[PDB]
């Protein structure tokens, strides 16, 4: 079904491809004419093609991308948050960078255990901001709010993070926590309170932020204040990876 349009790109292509199709010019082709495929053969063919089709170019490209790892480390030490984007899964890249590379480098440069890496699976729709902050408060042990700081039915998480920001401004600038956020534009983490929480955590220089995004409209999530607080350096890392872990929360039959 190639379009009979003169244009493909820009607003010219946008206005030229949104024309009106008559009823007799439409196709009444349905999913009932498709060959029937069960879940098991779907799983079998997908894990065969995701492990043997274009695996060697993906391997060589991934070996090119780890030459960027010292530059990523240098951008994290100067206070910038890393945002990775591209076509394909970036989950293995983020855990391999943060765990196998970045945490021993930060721990050895700050001279004995390595830096803890808190992983946020934003592709999970059950990612909850209060339990993430519970894990953060166990990892960092911040001072609790006094009675005048609780305000009047305020959000205790946001007030505690603001107190944390005012505390950590007069501390040595040594990274105490590595916050990895797979799929920062995921279904529950893209909400306003979660983004506000994560940007205010990104204000703190002692927390390293390594995040990834999958949606094409992800920079719509951040206004001027959130872009100032996040302090992103953007890095395009396209690899055409399968993304099989993130697909377990959706139904592939539909």
């Amino acid at each position: 079904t190639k379009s009979a349009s003169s244009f493909l790109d820009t607003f010219e292509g946008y206005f030229d491809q949104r024309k009106i199709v008559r009823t007799n010019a439409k196709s009444r082709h349905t999913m009932s004419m498709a060959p029937d495929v069960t879940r098991e053969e779907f799983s079998l063919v997908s894990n065969f093609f995701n492990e043997n089709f274009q695996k060697r170019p993906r391997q060589k490209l991934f070996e090119i991308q780890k030459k960027m790892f010292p530059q990523y480390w240098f951008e994290l030490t100067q206070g910038f948050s890393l945002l990775f984007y591209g076509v394909g899964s970036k989950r293995n890249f983020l855990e391999e960078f943060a765990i196998d590379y970045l945490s021993p480098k930060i721990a050895y440069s700050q001279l004995v255990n390595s830096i803890p890496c808190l992983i946020l699976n934003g592709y999970n729709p059950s990612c909850n901001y209060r339990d993430v902050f519970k894990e953060i408060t166990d990892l960092l042990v911040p001072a609790e709010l006094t009675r005048s700081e609780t305000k009047y039915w305020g959000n205790h998480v946001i007030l505690q993070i603001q107190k944390m920001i005012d505390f950590y401004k007069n501390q040595p600038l040594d990274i105490k926590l590595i916050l990895v956020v797979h799929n920062l534009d995921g279904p529950s983490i893209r909400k306003n309170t979660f983004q506000t929480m994560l940007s205010f955590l990104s204000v703190i220089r002692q927390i390293a932020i390594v995040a990834s995004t999958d949606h094409i409209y992800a920079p719509l999530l951040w206004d001027n204040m959130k872009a100032q607080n996040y302090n992103f350096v953007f890095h395009d890392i396209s690899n055409f990876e399968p993304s099989t872990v993130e697909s377990t929360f959706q139904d592939v039959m539909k």
Binding site: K191, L221, N224
Partner: protein, 228 residues
């Protein structure tokens, strides 16, 4: 102020009462029968009326009215910095909110065709209701970005591709416009920005977008003169 004016250069009560009836005769149609609004107008226009009292005017009420006639033709009860991308995004959102999406190729399409085809002909007959008198329509993100690209200002040009694409600055400006509520959504709390079900609409009147377009020297009225 009155006793400073009589030293700088029953009848005091006469001129105060005459000012009160002049205020009432000038502004009763505007204030209605409101005691409070007329009291504010009296308090606002009393010192400017005292400041135009002369020796020729103190015993001549009509000439003193004509000397300070500007205070009675206008009520004057009022209190009288966006980026270039934010300004053009506001203009494009107004265009998307008040032009129906089936004739944009009849206005914005300008580029040379290699493949045979026809653009939109345009609207056949004009409507007789000004659409800016009604509530704004809803649009998608990509229509707003397409019209914003259409209306944004423009051998080394071979590798130039002189058309501004929606980079992160455009999306950041759009998000700033949403958090200022110059753009609005269909839902207000727990907003899913990345859902295609969520649509956008302009949230400014015609006067605000008019002075915004004159701030950037954009002819926004030319897109509305032929339509109605």
């Amino acid at each position: 102020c009155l006793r400073k004016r009589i030293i700088e250069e029953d009848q005091f009560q006469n001129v105060a009462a005459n000012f009160i009836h002049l205020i009432v005769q000038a502004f009763h149609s505007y204030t209605g029968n409101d005691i409070f609004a007329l009291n504010d107008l009296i308090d606002f226009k009393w010192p400017k009326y005292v400041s135009r009292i002369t020796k020729e005017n103190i015993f001549e009420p009509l000439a003193l009215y004509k000397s300070a006639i500007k205070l009675f033709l206008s009520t004057d009860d009022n209190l009288s910095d966006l980026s270039i991308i934010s300004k053009y995004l506001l203009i494009a959102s107004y265009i998307c909110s008040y032009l129906e999406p089936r004739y944009d190729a009849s206005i914005f399409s300008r580029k040379t065709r290699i493949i045979q085809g026809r653009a939109a002909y345009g609207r056949r007959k004009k409507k007789e209701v000004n659409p800016r008198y009604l509530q704004p329509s809803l649009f998608a993100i990509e229509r707003l970005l397409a019209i914003f690209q259409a209306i944004f200002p423009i051998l080394s040009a071979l590798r130039e591709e002189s058309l501004m694409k929606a980079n992160i600055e455009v999306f950041q400006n759009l998000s700033e416009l949403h958090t200022l509520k110059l753009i609005a959504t269909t839902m207000n709390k727990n907003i899913d920005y990345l859902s295609p079900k969520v649509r956008w609409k302009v949230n400014v009147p015609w006067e605000i977008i008019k002075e915004i377009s004159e701030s950037v020297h954009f002819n926004i009225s030319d897109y509305f003169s032929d339509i109605h």
